[PDB]
């Protein structure tokens, strides 16, 4: 036990409607500037390459970034809090898996993020 923050990123498989593969990209938005990010795949070992693209640069875990990878179910989870309006940018997560792209564009910047935030949490 150490990563308690990881438990906050934990979420159950919910959004089902229309997906080709089982490599699903799930993002849930809270008004507190909270990104709920988790993805799952049907194949784990040597499968599903996820480009963690922020501002067209790949990011790694640190202060503002928190991301882990499960190998028992295939849950790759990331929990974003917030740093600064200047630091927050265009986050583009694309899972390149087979013939399907698990792409999610999530832009949080200044006034821009308050707009999308309130459309989820009103």
UniProtKB/Swiss-Prot annotation:
Protein localization: Cytoplasm, Myofibril, Sarcomere, M line
Q: Which tissues express it?
A: Ubiquitously expressed in all striated muscles. Expressed in all fiber types.
The coiled-coil segments of this chain are: none
Complexes and interactors: Homodimer. Interacts with TTN/titin and PNKD.
Q: What does this protein do?
A: May link the intermediate filament cytoskeleton to the M-disk of the myofibrils in striated muscle. May also contact myosin filaments. Also binds beta-integrins.
Please report the name of this protein according to its UniProt entry: Myomesin-1
What is the organism field in this record? Mus musculus (Mouse)
| Organism lineage | Eukaryota, Metazoa, Chordata, Craniata, Vertebrata
**Which residues of the whole protein are included?**
1208 to 1329 of 1667
């Amino acid at each position: 036990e150490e990563e308690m923050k990881r438990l906050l990123a934990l979420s159950q498989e919910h959004k089902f409607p229309t997906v080709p593969t089982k490599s699903e990209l799930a993002v849930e938005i809270l008004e507190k500037g909270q990104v709920r990010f988790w993805m799952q795949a049907e194949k784990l070992s040597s499968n599903a390459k996820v480009s963690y693209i922020f501002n067209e640069k790949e990011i790694f875990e640190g202060p503002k970034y928190k991301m882990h990878i499960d190998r028992n179910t295939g849950i790759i989870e990331m929990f974003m809090e917030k740093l600064q309006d200047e630091d927050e940018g265009t986050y583009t997560f694309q899972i390149q898996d087979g013939k399907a792209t698990g792409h999610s564009t999530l832009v949080l910047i200044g006034d821009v993020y308050k707009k999308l935030q309130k459309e989820a949490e009103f």
